[PDB]
Amino acid sequence: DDFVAKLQDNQRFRYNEVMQALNMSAALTARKTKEFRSPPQEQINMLLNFKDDKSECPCPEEIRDQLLDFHEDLMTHCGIE
Amino acid sequence: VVACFRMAPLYNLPRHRAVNLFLQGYEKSWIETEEHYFEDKLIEDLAKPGAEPPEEDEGTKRVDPLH
């Protein structure tokens, strides 16, 4: 519930930044809005890459930490310590 | 041009649709990729005759759970 709301707010803020910065270079806009032009399933799949150290996901570290803590709590509840 | 480029972003989508997409993505990205090794421990535990001679048997050695 709240994880996706925070993700959507962050995505809106990033999109606003990309609109503010698009006028600098048109070629920049192409791969900067590739994310927003991808299908929604791909968008959320590629935003859910906090695992490992690839760090290609454009997501805040605190937002990553919330999911990394929930995933540890879920493993503890599932008994996969 | 505009219609081709600007398809529905995530933030435009309603809350419940985004939640369902997050559930599917979280599943296939984290839950499936999560790996823990238990096969050797489980087989070793199942292959142990547990206190059978102390237990009342009055017969041949009872088959182990793996058996």
UniProtKB/Swiss-Prot annotation, chain A:
What tissue expression does the UniProt record report for this protein?
Answer: Detected in heart muscle (at protein level). Heart muscle, brain (cerebellum and hippocampus) and placenta.
In terms of superkingdom, the source organism counts as: Eukaryota
Q: Where found?
A: Sarcoplasmic reticulum membrane
Q: What induces it?
A: By TGFB1.
Question: How is the polypeptide modified once translated?
Answer: Channel activity is modulated by phosphorylation. Phosphorylation is increased in failing heart, leading to calcium leaks and increased cytoplasmic Ca(2+) levels.
Q: Would you identify the family this protein belongs to, as annotated?
A: Belongs to the ryanodine receptor (TC 1.A.3.1) family. RYR2 subfamily.
Record's comment describing the protein's domains:
The calcium release channel activity resides in the C-terminal region while the remaining part of the protein resides in the cytoplasm.
Biological role stated in the UniProt entry: Cytosolic calcium-activated calcium channel that mediates the release of Ca(2+) from the sarcoplasmic reticulum into the cytosol and thereby plays a key role in triggering cardiac muscle contraction. Aberrant channel activation can lead to cardiac arrhythmia. In cardiac myocytes, calcium release is triggered by increased Ca(2+) cytosolic levels due to activation of the L-type calcium channel CACNA1C. The calcium channel activity is modulated by formation of heterotetramers with RYR3. Required for cellular calcium ion homeostasis. Required for embryonic heart development.
Q: Report quaternary structure and partners.
A: Homotetramer. Can also form heterotetramers with RYR1 and RYR3. Interacts with FKBP1A and FKBP1B; these interactions may stabilize the channel in its closed state and prevent Ca(2+) leaks. Interacts with CALM and S100A1; these interactions regulate channel activity. Identified in a complex composed of RYR2, FKBP1B, PKA catalytic subunit, PRKAR2A, AKAP6, and the protein phosphatases PP2A and PP1. Interacts directly with FKBP1B, PKA, PP1 and PP2A. Interacts with SELENON. In cardiac muscles, identified in a complex, composed of FSD2, CMYA5 and RYR2.
Provide the disease association from the record.
Answer: Ventricular tachycardia, catecholaminergic polymorphic, 1, with or without atrial dysfunction and/or dilated cardiomyopathy: An arrhythmogenic disorder characterized by stress-induced, bidirectional ventricular tachycardia that may degenerate into cardiac arrest and cause sudden death. Patients present with recurrent syncope, seizures, or sudden death after physical activity or emotional stress. CPVT1 inheritance is autosomal dominant.
Report the protein name in the record. Ryanodine receptor 2
| Organism listed in the record | Homo sapiens
- Full-length numbering of the shown residues: 1930 to 2010 of 4967
